[PDB]
Amino acid sequence: NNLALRAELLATQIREPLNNSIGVLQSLTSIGKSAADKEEQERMLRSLFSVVGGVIISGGLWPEPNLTDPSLRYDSLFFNKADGQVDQLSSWNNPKAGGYDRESWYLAAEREAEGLYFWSPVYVDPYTRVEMITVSTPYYRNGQFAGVATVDLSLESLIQFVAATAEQYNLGVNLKDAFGVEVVSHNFRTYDNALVSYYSFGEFNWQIEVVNAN
Ligand SMILES: [Cl-]
């Protein structure tokens, strides 16, 4: 057959939500690095999450906190794509609740070099309750680290996309993340010396194993 070719075609599709998330992150960092005030940034972030599609379901800006008046310490700008409307959530900003600067996806990007991207483990967002993977990156202002930008990928949407694509190409696929978690497993099994095509998106990035479907 043409297993290796179809496996590359599948990998190219699996790459789309990855590329898509990076692109949205770059828009977020543009907004964070800009001179826009907070109401203007909220406006642009709402518009951004209104226009993005695919598996992107939520995300936003996470300024370095000022740990005062309790309501002032945290001023995250976090947006969730619900009917089809976009909601801004304030849930991370009450100090009593712990704040956001100790979260894995914040810490991974904190004070890192602009232009580096970090992938969170799978988790259920404690406030939107959506199971997701998060890509994060730092943004800077005046040379000084200013905060973290995030984009959340819906796991459910990613699974449906990867599995539907594999099925169209008459493939089975297992996709694992940088923590070894099985993100998607669609019609994947090995017996009678079936060939497996392996493709790595990076040493600590996603991995796929691909078989022909019968
Ligand atoms: Cl699955």
Question: What CA–CA distances, in Å, run from 48 to 55, 127, 205?
Answer: 14, 20, 26
Which pair of structure tokens corresponds to residue 81?
């794509």
Question: What CA–CA distances, in Å, run from 167 to 25, 161, 186?
Answer: 30, 10, 8
Cα–Cα distance measured from residue 89 to residue 182, given in angstroms and rounded to the nearest whole number: 30
Alpha helices of 63-183 — where are they, by DSSP H? Answer: 104-109, 155-168
Question: What CA–CA distances, in Å, run from 90 to 4, 102, 125?
Answer: 47, 17, 14
Taken in order of first residue, the domains within the chain and their CATH numbers are: 13-154 (3.30.450.20), 157-212 (no CATH)
Cα–Cα distance measured from residue 128 to residue 81, given in angstroms and rounded to the nearest whole number: 10
CA–centroid distance, residue 175 to ligand 1 (Å): 9
Sequence-distant (6+) residues with CB within 8 A of 35 are: none
CA–centroid distance, residue 29 to ligand 1 (Å): 32
Sequence-distant (6+) residues with CB within 8 A of 31 are: 41, 44, 45, 48, 61
Neighbours of ion ligand 1 (CB under 5 A): 184-185
Cα–Cα distance measured from residue 55 to residue 65, given in angstroms and rounded to the nearest whole number: 29
Method by which the coordinates were obtained = X-ray
Cα–Cα distance measured from residue 187 to residue 35, given in angstroms and rounded to the nearest whole number: 50
Cα–Cα distance measured from residue 162 to residue 173, given in angstroms and rounded to the nearest whole number: 8
Cα–Cα distance measured from residue 79 to residue 122, given in angstroms and rounded to the nearest whole number: 19
CA–centroid distance, residue 83 to ligand 1 (Å): 25
- Contact status, residue 100 vs residue 91, Cβ threshold 8 Å: no
CA–centroid distance, residue 62 to ligand 1 (Å): 31
CA–centroid distance, residue 155 to ligand 1 (Å): 9
